[PDB]
Amino acid sequence: LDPRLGANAFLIIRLDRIIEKLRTKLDEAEKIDPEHFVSEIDARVTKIEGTHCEKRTFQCGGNEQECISDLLVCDGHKDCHNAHDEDPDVCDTSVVKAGNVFSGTSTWHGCLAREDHVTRITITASKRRKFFTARIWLRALVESELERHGENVTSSFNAKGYYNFASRRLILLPTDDHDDHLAVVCSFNRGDNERAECHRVTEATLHQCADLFVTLEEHD
Amino acid sequence: LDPRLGANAFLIIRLDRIIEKLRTKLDEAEKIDPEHFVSEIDARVTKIEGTHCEKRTFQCGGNEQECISDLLVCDGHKDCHNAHDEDPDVCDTSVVKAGNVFSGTSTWHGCLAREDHVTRITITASKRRKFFTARIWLRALVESELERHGENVTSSFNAKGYYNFASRRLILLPTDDHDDHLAVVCSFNRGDNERAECHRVTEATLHQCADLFVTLEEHD
Amino acid sequence: RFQYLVKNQNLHIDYLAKKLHDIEEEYNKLTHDVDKKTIRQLKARISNLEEHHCDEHESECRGDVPECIHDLLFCDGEKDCRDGSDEDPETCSLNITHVGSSYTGLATWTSCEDLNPDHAIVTITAAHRKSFFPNRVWLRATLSYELDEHDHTVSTTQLRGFYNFGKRELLLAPLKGQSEGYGVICDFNLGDDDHADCKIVVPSSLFVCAHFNAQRY
Amino acid sequence: RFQYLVKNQNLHIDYLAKKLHDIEEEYNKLTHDVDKKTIRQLKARISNLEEHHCDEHESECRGDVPECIHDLLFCDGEKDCRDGSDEDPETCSLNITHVGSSYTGLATWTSCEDLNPDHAIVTITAAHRKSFFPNRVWLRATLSYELDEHDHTVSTTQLRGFYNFGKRELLLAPLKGQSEGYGVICDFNLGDDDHADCKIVVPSSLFVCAHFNAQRY
Amino acid sequence: QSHDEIIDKLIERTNKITTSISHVESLLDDRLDPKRIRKAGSLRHRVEELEDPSCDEHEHQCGGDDPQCISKLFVCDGHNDCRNGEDEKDCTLPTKAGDKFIGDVCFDHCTKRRPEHMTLAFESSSIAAFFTPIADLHVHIEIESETDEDESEVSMPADGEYSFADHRLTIHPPEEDGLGLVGEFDGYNFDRFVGHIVHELSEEVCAEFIFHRKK
Amino acid sequence: QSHDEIIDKLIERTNKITTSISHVESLLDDRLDPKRIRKAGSLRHRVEELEDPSCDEHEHQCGGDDPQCISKLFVCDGHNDCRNGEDEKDCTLPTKAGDKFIGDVCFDHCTKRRPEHMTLAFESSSIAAFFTPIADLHVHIEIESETDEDESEVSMPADGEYSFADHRLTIHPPEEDGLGLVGEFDGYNFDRFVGHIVHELSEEVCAEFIFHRKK
Amino acid sequence: KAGDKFIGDVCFDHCTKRRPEHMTLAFESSSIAAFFTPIADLHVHIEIESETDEDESEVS
């Protein structure tokens, strides 16, 4: 009657706190994806595991082992029979897709006067064809946060360049600016997609003036 | 606290009995459709309100007032411009459709020996074309519940016949039976669809041996 | 606790709301009661159509008493009747008197029309009121009937005449000057408004040139 | 009443059931943990690939101790090793020894192949066990490589040879009697199983006729 | 505070339903509502009047789905005629007692004076315990005439019965003369009834009065 | 009866959820579960080892998202080097006290006898209150040799330190001779550490022993 | 407000060469000065999906 039923509640109230605390755990669980971490190691290791091939050649997949000249291989139509390219996993636009913002610390050799600091490469625009995998032409905004005499300032210049699917390279040159602050260059294979290894360089010299390791900032 | 909230319940418990009793009313309400009753009177009265036209002619609708020969008018294609027929309300298959069972009392002049009784006309089958409005060929089963010496017996014979859309007539003749129990004939315009006015008759004589007012029995 | 038992009370309610919606829903499925405005139309249609006691050109007073008075006496201006049934709206009505009511049907000529019976339309063009006047208008209208479907033409004669209260009958003739003009007689008495038994006559002898059962328009 | 409060208690529960389903649901959305079977494969891929101390034709005992013993001594039948690392399955394994493992890659001939580098397939046809035998098989296989795509033809030479534990290397030569037969050397040592650095040689001088990086199949 | 926020919730929802409830109870009452019933049933009657009649003049039509004809004498035996059960379900006897009815003349061949009006007072009414079908009445027919010479007033008393099915009350003639009254009801609706004055034997009609119930 | 049917309902549903709950608490623990962490982190290490290294030999790589190089001397000042906060989050000092470690020889140029084994007992260990980075140790290196003539036993004592970041304990040579031990950890995992015997000055390696923690 | 997207349907375009069918208007940020009600400052991206003769062009 009243006891076994009015007490069967102190039993249910429990499940209420439980179910709630359980919500918190499902939140903690979403932060550690195993399937994600493992992927970090895979890429991390694959990064350690040079080219057999010759540069600006494309290495085919498991089945055979052949070299293909880059431009030819990214016809946009299948380079090869198999084809390595055709498989959806590589071609997949989304990860690649610009509009991302990349930040990171730029340690200088000190071609520039100024102390170490952060750079913030942010993709402004990006044309191709409709498809168009190989090559991605793009405009972007490069900022740095450096101190002048007086307070914190920000040196931004506008840049134009391209992304080479195969190259795993993003080249950003200055537009027509009086500043004409030197060109940034980033490569993919971090093994994360997110992350890239960059360097500030001069066109003419095509030396490396500085090392810059960027990371994609979360959009939200 | 405990009073205004524990009492606000004796208030809700009320709505519980109310809402329930209210269910019963919604059940009572479905039994008297006004929109239905009114229709009964309309038909009831329209039944009182002869033909201007000549028999086996079709009276057009409101707009003009013209007579059309029956067969011609139910071409199946539009007899007339307007057309009366074409309008969906009359043509509507469903109400018309056989498979119905009709029962009722058959009062005799007493061509048959036997005391008054009930007849049960039930449509066995019904062919036409696919469309096919005008004419509906059909087979049916005619039973009566009459007493012989000894207990309650049932005289069933099988019948074949047709339904005339225009005629508002259902003619059922016996098949080849030794009994060859006389042919039943029903007309529509009761003004209900459901209900019909029938008579038992002989083919040859084409006299009326008995009056029979049937009503469609509910399928459920 | 306080917070507690409440969490479910709001549920017992969120409940009722549904058991009710599932009702108000099953309600709409079942049709809406036909618009007393329906019964009214029946009592009408029915009532318009049995004899009246009176021999010709007498009509009964509207109200409870049957009683029959001669058609003419309307109006004194004053209640001819004891009953004063008159004074009641159904007699002095606007709509009834109202001009520019049109009646049509399919005219089938005994006489003239070689062709296939055509549409006839007798419509009221003007009709005298004064102020008070409970009564019947003395009026003017037009009778139009198609030549053909083919021709797409149509005869339109102007008419003059009145409406007999007692008779329930509309009597129109050609205004004049045509010397052959044609006229038309329409009887009310279904009892309905709308509906009439019109017959195109010859304004002479009042002989039926053709007949057409009409409705308004 | 009794009936009462219950009607809602079952509701408070029918509630939890939903707040939970809306959880177990949001759970499945988030993927399933990769099959310890994944990490295992990494530790493997990784481990297969740094030097080992030993100069040639010595291999280290499997276990904790590094220690290096000469390749040959396997087997006593008995644990050559102090450690007895041997006795452990990763050494005496079935799969490892297992016959009828096939390795292929794309052979690109320095030497012969005018044409476009073709598919090479060295597959094991038989290999001696006895019972106990922790060790390396002495075996027979077949080397097949496409003539062409066009031709749709293909050379298939039979081979004889062994597998060097220490070397991680598969060494096969033409069985005989061909007098020109061709042979093949495949090095394990990614550390992986599957993967090898094979090179089609001339059974004479052991001179590299062509090279092909292989996988299993 | 915590307590309060809680408590308010449940009131305003109890009503939010108590409305949806009575809302339906209305839509239901609308399909049962009695004023609609009679109004429609009334229409039915008009129809029952049209036509060569199912039952006889004498005979009573039970209804309805299935017709059946029984004698007017025949119901309300107390045995049931009707499957339907008409001979026993029509709960109310049209004929009360004490009622006064005022008749307005409209056609009087019948009397010399012709009166404007004619009051009909019902003194007593008793039904035999065995007979439903016929209720016996005692009535005073009052009259206010003006004579040429003087004024005359009259209150002739007469016996009469009211028949069950007919709704027709026959008032046997007060007079030796055998002028009698015969009013046939619509009944409830309306207590208004047309009253024909006839030669009882002949059943010749020679005077019509519309009688209205005085309240 | 009425009471009973009621009461049962609520029990078997409280559990039907208490299951779905702990069911998830499991799937969660599966993505946090520590055995998976180390196992994966362990893999990370193998990678950190490949390559020309971010930080120096001397310098310590903070991590991680953004690299930063600070001195091995430099952490664990107590000032924070790291945004990251490495110099202070690695909760545990690898170096306990009292531990015994058994080393199995596998390459001994170094001694005459070459012993099979070599026990390493840790007598004391103290960290200076100011210095995290370096923990000073006192150790007895035990040895069971067989000499030609007789059997000899030894328990030479030596000082030594363990460096924070390096996980590398240096045991300054017991001997005048200046043969010393240098074992560099994986650390926890494994307490197993390769022990190189070197000429302290030279840092010439001339003896390798795999040391396992005795429990 | 802020964050709103607005889709415009052309109906009279002398103005551009391509004339586009449509034209999306995305509102990135919006801030009002603390002192000024009357005017709220906005930052907007005008997106466009044109088809060019040669290829397809997209703009923001």
TrEMBL record, chains A, B:
<feature type="disulfide bond">
    <location>
        <begin position="60"/>
        <end position="80"/>
    </location>
</feature>
<keyword id="KW-0106">Calcium</keyword>
<keyword id="KW-1015">Disulfide bond</keyword>
<feature type="disulfide bond">
    <location>
        <begin position="74"/>
        <end position="91"/>
    </location>
</feature>
<feature type="binding site">
    <location>
        <position position="85"/>
    </location>
    <ligand>
        <name>Ca(2+)</name>
    </ligand>
</feature>
<keyword id="KW-0732">Signal</keyword>
<feature type="disulfide bond">
    <location>
        <begin position="111"/>
        <end position="209"/>
    </location>
</feature>
<feature type="binding site">
    <location>
        <position position="77"/>
    </location>
    <ligand>
        <name>Ca(2+)</name>
    </ligand>
</feature>
<feature type="disulfide bond">
    <location>
        <begin position="53"/>
        <end position="67"/>
    </location>
</feature>
<feature type="binding site">
    <location>
        <position position="86"/>
    </location>
    <ligand>
        <name>Ca(2+)</name>
    </ligand>
</feature>
<feature type="binding site">
    <location>
        <position position="72"/>
    </location>
    <ligand>
        <name>Ca(2+)</name>
    </ligand>
</feature>
<feature type="binding site">
    <location>
        <position position="75"/>
    </location>
    <ligand>
        <name>Ca(2+)</name>
    </ligand>
</feature>
TrEMBL record, chains C, D:
<keyword id="KW-0479">Metal-binding</keyword>
<feature type="disulfide bond">
    <location>
        <begin position="112"/>
        <end position="209"/>
    </location>
</feature>
<keyword id="KW-1015">Disulfide bond</keyword>
<feature type="binding site">
    <location>
        <position position="76"/>
    </location>
    <ligand>
        <name>Ca(2+)</name>
    </ligand>
</feature>
<dbReference type="InterPro" id="IPR031639">
    <property type="entry name" value="Eryth_link_C"/>
</dbReference>
<feature type="disulfide bond">
    <location>
        <begin position="75"/>
        <end position="92"/>
    </location>
</feature>
<dbReference type="InterPro" id="IPR023415">
    <property type="entry name" value="LDLR_class-A_CS"/>
</dbReference>
<dbReference type="InterPro" id="IPR002172">
    <property type="entry name" value="LDrepeatLR_classA_rpt"/>
</dbReference>
<dbReference type="InterPro" id="IPR037246">
    <property type="entry name" value="Extrac_hemoglob_link_heterodim"/>
</dbReference>
<feature type="binding site">
    <location>
        <position position="78"/>
    </location>
    <ligand>
        <name>Ca(2+)</name>
    </ligand>
</feature>
<dbReference type="GO" id="GO:0046872">
    <property type="term" value="F:metal ion binding"/>
</dbReference>
<feature type="binding site">
    <location>
        <position position="73"/>
    </location>
    <ligand>
        <name>Ca(2+)</name>
    </ligand>
</feature>
TrEMBL record, chains E, F:
<dbReference type="GO" id="GO:0046872">
    <property type="term" value="F:metal ion binding"/>
</dbReference>
<dbReference type="InterPro" id="IPR037246">
    <property type="entry name" value="Extrac_hemoglob_link_heterodim"/>
</dbReference>
<dbReference type="InterPro" id="IPR036055">
    <property type="entry name" value="LDL_receptor-like_sf"/>
</dbReference>
<dbReference type="InterPro" id="IPR023415">
    <property type="entry name" value="LDLR_class-A_CS"/>
</dbReference>
<keyword id="KW-0732">Signal</keyword>
<keyword id="KW-1015">Disulfide bond</keyword>
<feature type="disulfide bond">
    <location>
        <begin position="62"/>
        <end position="82"/>
    </location>
</feature>
<feature type="disulfide bond">
    <location>
        <begin position="76"/>
        <end position="91"/>
    </location>
</feature>
<feature type="domain" description="Annelid erythrocruorin linker subunit C-terminal">
    <location>
        <begin position="94"/>
        <end position="214"/>
    </location>
</feature>
<feature type="binding site">
    <location>
        <position position="79"/>
    </location>
    <ligand>
        <name>Ca(2+)</name>
    </ligand>
</feature>
<feature type="binding site">
    <location>
        <position position="88"/>
    </location>
    <ligand>
        <name>Ca(2+)</name>
    </ligand>
</feature>
<feature type="binding site">
    <location>
        <position position="77"/>
    </location>
    <ligand>
        <name>Ca(2+)</name>
    </ligand>
</feature>
Automatic annotation (TrEMBL), chain G:
<protein>
    <submittedName>
        <fullName>Extracellular hemoglobin linker L3 subunit</fullName>
    </submittedName>
</protein>
